[PDB]
Design a protein around this ligand. Structure first.
Ligand code: TQG
Ligand code: TQG
Lengths: 431, 406
């Protein structure tokens, strides 16, 4: 129940005399994601005016110009290909849609089988990162609802990590809020991530990612999504309990993730001998040597993986699970990252999926998603879009900074057991 | 914990004195405390809030008045509201360690820190001779702002106070008709009315009911009931049955659901929807515990609806006229307050709609403050409960399916 009003390309609006076309080189981290789908997130508002939003977007794209570029695929004479990002100002796909029968309650209170109507609010479903040669690296959809507006976006993981994407959304909202021409918002020089793998030749020669199985997103699933809210009081309670049991210092988010992990596995139906993983995004800017600037733009995120058996996770307590997470984070070193990049170049792996039997943590509690006031008020919710993956756990800072929200994608049988888990529902509010 | 930055008397912006006479409904509430409610925001600029309040008091000028107490020669007293522009008490305070999470998620013993966000705790309606009839406190938090207010029930009902808040925020964000007062609608009662001189371990939880679960309860109640039942009647009945189930009361006890009734359209002649003043009464549905527990949701909902249908003009008149010859100026009930009809979120003062609405002290067992949800189809309730009832409610699987308790 969604009609498209307009589909257009939004180009950067360049007050400056345009410079040459910058080329951005792709690392093993970027190339190993070429077959994954665009990541899709969005913000819910009481009010957004689309004209101002589109105008301010063109200005913001000038300031974050790699988001307006395209992948370029080179054919090597050895029958491999190479990719780089060309900052050519090709522009961003921008969709204006209307879903006049959908109201805020419907998106705030989402609960149950996915995909549902909400999937259609996102613009990049089924788009893979290697499609960025011909589709934009950022895609935006603004959907007017009965009594609100949703701004959804999808982005190519080869051009940006979530840290960078949320910095762009914050700049865009600031411009939109103050004046759409950008004349009243400070322009800042963009620092690029650059090339930080000094022992790896580039561009890296890889097999063509499109000459690969190419697997569907519209296939029927049995997945559901639920929202989990953890209050400040309960975050603190979990934090204290994890630290009481643990032998090293455990952060609040580690304790809460460990609690969710244990609970998710308790109700999974997995055998004790199965391995379960907690996959966590790690911002590597400050772990690399030399470290990169905290504001450098691009994907500088690595996925850390904590591995245990189901039996181990259930037999030990909360503090032990939190220690597995923390130990994994501590292991994500510079020497590790570089050695592994050099191994990747001699055993290229570009998977189509992550796997469905893990806790797959994404986004971050650190991103101030509510600071995105476009001029009519801060958002009232932050959500993720397709694709749907069992075990996905999207982390959002709460409207209350001390609280946490999680958007969890789970099998129906797991939800059914989770909603009857008395202790879980003491610590976590499921909607 | 709470630091006061400033206190001001805000009069109407514009520079005989109109008298508003008090009805038996007003006079009966003289010993009650001021009612206190408020709105939570990301951002409020205090200077603009205060200037706009002066402008708003031009329109809602009774809120800037004072009670006047007359001593009559027959050893009684009389009260009226003198619209003298004395002004509204306006307090600016800072709670630097309190954050949005704390107010959104209040849960547990009351009174707690939040009580201090409200300006009129311990103030009774008869104190309006010397204290303002509306009191405002704007409390800056670590990462947000709360606008708390208390009001004297002799000058306004909740319908009127929320219309005032709506007008104030509209003025601050920047009226085709002038303010019309409710007037004297008891033609068989003389004024001023002569009266005698009028002078617990509780917890609060937030309940949210989703659009989906409101509709489920509505459908259930209507399937069971023989008259049409509204969504709010169905949800209130469900909460009522659940509270009584976990109350510890025996079958023979009488228990009540108390509900605010806007009487404007029930009076004859009916009064204008926007007429200003207190034109509300409390309706009381009475049942025994055993009956409420034995019968289903639709029957409880019918008890509420039947009570509402009985709130007639003729009854109100007869009761008021006898009240003047039997002045009465004064639990484990369901005490419903506020209403789903009030649009909480239209109160944008210029920096964004509110992110929550809340009630303040006083705290009383069984209070259930109704707020329309951010999601317009949904409902929020601020419930004041005994710890033993809470413990039973959190272990009630069905209740926690229909209602999200935080
Ligand atoms: O950015 C991240 O959270 C991981 C990025 C990347 N993974 C994918 O790009 C596809 O798998 C996922 C994993 C998590 C969330 C989603 C989603 O669509 O939200 C998809 C990786 O694992 O290195
Ligand atoms: O407006 C209403 O809900 C009732 C008004 C009045 N009642 C009192 O003035 C004192 O009893 C209450 C009842 C409900 C809430 C509170 C509170 O403090 O929120 C106090 C009455 O019965 O006509």
């Amino acid at each position: 129940e969604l009609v498209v009003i307009s589909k257009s390309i939004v180009n950067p609006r360049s007050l400056k005399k345009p410079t040459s076309v910058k080329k951005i080189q792709l690392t093993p981290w970027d190339l190993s994601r070429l077959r994954f789908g665009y990541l899709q997130r969005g913000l819910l508002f009481h009010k957004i005016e689309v004209k101002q939003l589109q105008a301010s977007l063109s200005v913001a794209l000038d300031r974050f110009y790699p988001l307006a570029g395209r992948l370029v695929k080179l054919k090597n004479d050895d029958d491999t290909v190479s990719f780089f990002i060309s900052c050519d100002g090709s522009g961003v796909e921008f969709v204006h849609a209307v879903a006049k029968n959908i109201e805020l309650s419907d998106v705030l209170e989402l609960s149950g089988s996915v995909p549902g109507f909400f999937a259609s609010f996102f613009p990049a479903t089924g788009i893979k990162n290697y499609h960025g040669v011909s589709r934009s690296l950022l895609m935006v959809q603004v959907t007017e609802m009965k009594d609100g507006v949703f701004i959804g976006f999808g982005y190519n993981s080869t051009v940006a990590d979530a840290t960078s994407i949320w910095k762009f959304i914050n700049a865009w909202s600031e411009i939109c809020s103050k004046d759409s021409s950008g004349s009243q918002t400070f322009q800042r020089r963009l620092h690029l991530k650059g090339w930080f793998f000094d022992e790896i030749d580039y561009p890296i020669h890889i097999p063509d990612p499109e000459t690969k199985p190419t697997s569907y997103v519209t296939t029927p699933t049995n997945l559901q999504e639920k929202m989990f809210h953890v209050t400040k009081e309960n975050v603190l309670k979990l934090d204290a309990k994890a630290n009481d049991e643990a032998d090293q210092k455990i952060s609040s988010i580690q304790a809460v993730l460990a609690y969710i992990w244990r609970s998710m596995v308790k109700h999974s139906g997995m055998s004790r001998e199965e391995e379960t993983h907690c996959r966590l995004p790690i911002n590597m800017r400050q772990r690399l040597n030399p470290p990169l600037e905290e504001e450098c733009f691009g994907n500088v995120s690595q996925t850390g993986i904590a591995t245990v058996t189901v039996g181990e996770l259930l037999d030990h307590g909360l503090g032990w699970a939190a220690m597995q997470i923390n130990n994994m984070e501590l292991s994500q070193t510079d020497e590790k990252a570089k050695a592994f990049a050099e191994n990747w170049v001699k055993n290229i792996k570009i998977p189509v999926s992550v796997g469905s039997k893990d806790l797959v943590v994404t986004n971050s509690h650190r991103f101030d998603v509510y600071c995105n006031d476009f001029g009519w008020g801060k958002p009232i919710a932050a959500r993720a879009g397709p694709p749907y993956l069992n075990g996905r756990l999207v982390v959002f800072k709460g409207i209350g900074e001390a609280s946490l929200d999680f958007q969890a994608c789970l099998l129906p049988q797991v939800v059914e057991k989770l909603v009857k888990d008395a202790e879980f529902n003491e610590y976590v509010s499921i909607v």
